[PDB]
Structure formats: structure tokens, C-alpha cells
Amino acid sequence: MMHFGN
Amino acid sequence: MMHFGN
Amino acid sequence: MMHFGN
Amino acid sequence: MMHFGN
Amino acid sequence: MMHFGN
Amino acid sequence: MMHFGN
Amino acid sequence: MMHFGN
Amino acid sequence: MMHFGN
Amino acid sequence: MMHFGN
Amino acid sequence: MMHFGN
Amino acid sequence: MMHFGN
Amino acid sequence: MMHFGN
Description:
- The structure is a homododecamer.
- Chain A is mostly beta strands.
- The first copy, chain A, has one strand spanning 2-4.
- Chain A is built from no helices and 1 strand.
- Chains D and E meet through β1 of D and β1 of E.
- Chains A, B, C, D, E, F, G, H, I, J, K, L: Belongs to the prion family.
């Protein structure tokens, strides 16, 4: 999984 | 935001 | 799955 | 927003 | 499935 | 923030 | 199921 | 709000 | 399940 | 808020 | 599970 | 806040 956030 | 997952 | 959001 | 999924 | 929204 | 995981 | 609301 | 579920 | 809210 | 779960 | 909140 | 768990 790859998560990109603030 | 981006979420790449299964 | 691929999710693109705010 | 974009959701690509099954 | 592909969903494009606000 | 970025999280790359399984 | 997919629900989109306020 | 968005809810994607079974 | 995926839930997006306030 | 986002909750990704089973 | 992944939870993102305040 | 973020919680990644099982």
C-alpha cells in the first residue's frame, strides 16, 4: 500500500 | 491525498 | 484500488 | 475526487 | 469500477 | 506525509 | 455499496 | 461524506 | 470498507 | 477523517 | 486498518 | 492523528 497525505 | 492499495 | 482526493 | 476500484 | 466526482 | 507499507 | 452524501 | 462498503 | 468524512 | 478497514 | 483523524 | 493497525 502507498498513502500520500497532509 | 492519494491512497493506492489492494 | 486507487483513490484520489482532497 | 477519483476512485478506481473493483 | 471508475468514479469521478467533486 | 507518506506511508509505503504492506 | 457506494454512498455519496453531505 | 463517502462510504464505500459491502 | 472505506469511509470519508468530516 | 478517513477510515479504511475491513 | 488505517484511521486518519483530528 | 493517524492509527495504522490490524
